[PDB]
């Protein structure tokens, strides 16, 4: 049978970028015709493999990572990037083999008065390593100041809300991102293109 790409791309709700989702796709036949052939995708860049060549290769596991960021942050979902998203929320490796897909989801993820459900990690001590997911909600400390879970001095909350509103500029509008990672492991071929 086929691979459930529809469950990820046509999902009614995405995860926040700090807690980005991962769908493990195995033991199915995939068709990358329909994907490149849509016209609702504003970003479609592939790294290490052509999008029309995927119908001819076999991989062992195909990972589908999905989350939501604003438009200006879409540039950071690429190998060898820096910024708040690339360093603290979702890091791609420098030798990333796959495609990055994103589309304007302002019709879905922004609310009048602000949709404060989509968050992102603003503070972290060291950079995320490739494909790392930090879901901690511990109060970040910059030094050594008593506080006790009270948002005071040198004791703030690490996550930050987007507050997507529909009248925002496209740089601040929500963008749904699906990251397809093609893991050609040494193993039995489970996911081939056809």
């Amino acid at each position: 049978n086929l691979c459930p790409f529809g469950e990820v791309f046509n999902a009614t709700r995405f995860a926040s970028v700090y807690a980005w989702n991962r769908k493990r796709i195995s033991n199915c036949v995939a068709d990358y015709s329909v994907l490149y052939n849509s016209a609702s995708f504003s970003t479609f860049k592939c790294y290490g493999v052509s999008p029309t060549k995927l119908n001819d290769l076999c991989f062992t596991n195909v990972y589908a990572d999905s989350f939501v960021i604003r438009g200006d942050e879409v540039r950071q979902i690429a190998p060898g990037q820096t910024g708040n998203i690339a360093d603290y929320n979702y890091k791609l490796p420098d030798d990333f083999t796959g495609c990055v897909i994103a589309w304007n989801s302002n019709n879905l993820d922004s609310k009048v008065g602000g949709n404060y459900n989509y968050l992102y990690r603003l503070f972290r001590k060291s950079n995320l390593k490739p494909f790392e997911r930090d879901i901690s909600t511990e109060i970040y400390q910059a030094g050594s100041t008593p506080c006790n879970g009270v948002k005071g001095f040198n004791c703030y909350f690490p996550l930050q809300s987007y507050g997507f509103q529909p009248t925002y500029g496209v740089g601040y509008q929500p963008y749904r991102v699906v990251v397809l990672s093609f893991e050609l492991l040494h193993a039995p071929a489970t996911v081939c293109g056809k």
Partner: antibody
Amino acid sequence: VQLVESGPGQVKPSETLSLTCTVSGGSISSSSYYWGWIRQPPGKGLEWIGSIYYSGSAYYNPSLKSRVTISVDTSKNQFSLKLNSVTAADTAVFYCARHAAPSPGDNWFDPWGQGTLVTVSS
Amino acid sequence: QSVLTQPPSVSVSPGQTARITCSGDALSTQNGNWYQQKPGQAPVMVICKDSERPSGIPERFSGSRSGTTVTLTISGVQAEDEADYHCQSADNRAHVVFGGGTKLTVLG
């Protein structure tokens, strides 16, 4: 762009106050601007009531939240205001302005309407 | 929830520079906006994004920001200015709020 207010100028106490604002210089159906209501009692400060969008969702004051509701009509290019259970502290001049929200904290009222005075008194 | 605080009265002699301040915990995550309202008239926007001039605004008006306090600065205050001036902002929970209002008087 111009905004015009419409509605009765007198409301008895504890009643529903209805007001309709009509714009004529652009389009309410635009995806870049809100449409709000602002009041000020005579010789007092300003007070924002609620801003509505061309869809339907809107947000209002914490204080005036239960007895307030806002509607829109893209067909007639106009939005309205409803204030249930009007006491006499509601005696004020009601303006309808145009609301711009570019980034997360950027929120201003670009062109105001001249405003109508509704005096609540039995 | 928050409150925008501004003085109710500011006096200046002709030609001098008037300075109106507006402060609040809101002004952390928040910008500020300045409106001039003449007696029996709708307010008019004067300052965008804390410190910017729209088209119909002459260069004599300037805005500044300092921590939790924004400042509307009118240079060469003339008689054409005497009015009530208002600051405004809109927090995380989407609470769009006004200050109390400052009445400018040209001390004649």
